[PDB]
Design a protein around this ligand. Sequence first.
Ligand SMILES: O=C(Nc1cccc(-c2nnn[nH]2)c1)c1cccc(C(F)(F)F)c1
Ligand SMILES: O=C(Nc1cccc(-c2nnn[nH]2)c1)c1cccc(C(F)(F)F)c1
Ligand SMILES: O=C(Nc1cccc(-c2nnn[nH]2)c1)c1cccc(C(F)(F)F)c1
Ligand SMILES: O=C(Nc1cccc(-c2nnn[nH]2)c1)c1cccc(C(F)(F)F)c1
Length: 260
Amino acid sequence: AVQQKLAALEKSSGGRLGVALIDTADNTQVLYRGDERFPMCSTSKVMAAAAVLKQSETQKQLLNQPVEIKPADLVNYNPIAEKHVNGTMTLAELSAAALQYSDNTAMNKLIAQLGGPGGVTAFARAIGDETFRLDRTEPTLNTAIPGDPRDTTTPRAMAQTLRQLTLGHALGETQRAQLVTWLKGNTTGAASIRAGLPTSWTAGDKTGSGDYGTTNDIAVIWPQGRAPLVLVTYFTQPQQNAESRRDVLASAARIIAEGL
Ligand SMILES: O=C(Nc1cccc(-c2nnn[nH]2)c1)c1cccc(C(F)(F)F)c1
Ligand SMILES: O=C(Nc1cccc(-c2nnn[nH]2)c1)c1cccc(C(F)(F)F)c1
Ligand SMILES: O=C(Nc1cccc(-c2nnn[nH]2)c1)c1cccc(C(F)(F)F)c1
Ligand SMILES: O=C(Nc1cccc(-c2nnn[nH]2)c1)c1cccc(C(F)(F)F)c1
């Protein structure tokens, strides 16, 4: 029934919608196009920050390690990094900037700390995600071309990974709490999944967008009185210059919430 509602939303949206919900109260899933590939865009920033948190388990000072920010490093969306050009940010600062402000320069420093987009993929594989692939750096990982396998995952795989990272044992306890704290402090998410939820349903999320009107969000949610949920909503459209549709994500989330 919920799949039929998501189908109706998708049909009136003009685009292609992917949804994965895990309800941790019972482990049950709702999936819509759950095994189709979608471009991740900045939702991939969660995997890169989590990989750096995992590194920090064996290097307790890692998050205070300074990283030089040079003029040439700046890319196309650098609201935090631009303040630090010719200076340094720590890996904690870059993680917070990437996750909470979606800073693309900050993401690039995370990727570099992992040895390139392949290192981020390696971390995903290590935590049991056989699906995620990061192929490119910022900003080109957001080209979101239909059919292109690069920088994609499926909603099912991303939900299962987000659950392991934020609620399971993929990370040490400190690190898990740090990741959840960062997601719950996101600045960019009030129009997306969380717009479709009751106000009482606490949450953290990471948005993404790109060409092809691609509009994404992944969230960990604490519904009032209930065990947490993990929700992935991915959306992409047929034309390169299509406009973002955060409202579609909100609509998906609302359908999911009403179906619980
Ligand atoms: O804990 C899990 N499931 C679950 C669901 C409902 C109840 C319980 C439970 N009740 N009492 N002790 N565990 C556990 C669980 C299953 C797969 C994966 C994960 C993980 F690690 F969070 F991703 C957790
Ligand atoms: O799914 C369950 N546990 C589970 C399964 C697989 C992985 C994990 C898990 N991985 N990391 N942390 N928990 C937990 C689960 C669900 C209801 C009830 C129970 C219980 F408590 F054993 F009876 C377990
Ligand atoms: O700034 C954003 N996108 C962006 C940045 C730079 C270039 C372009 C772009 N160039 N050509 N087509 N889009 C888009 C952007 C979009 C939605 C949401 C956010 C935010 F605020 F970080 F969450 C940023
Ligand atoms: O970098 C891009 N967008 C962007 C940048 C930073 C943050 C976000 C964003 N955050 N939350 N939702 N989107 C999007 C971007 C957009 C269109 C096209 C391209 C590309 F791939 F370079 F051509 C990049």
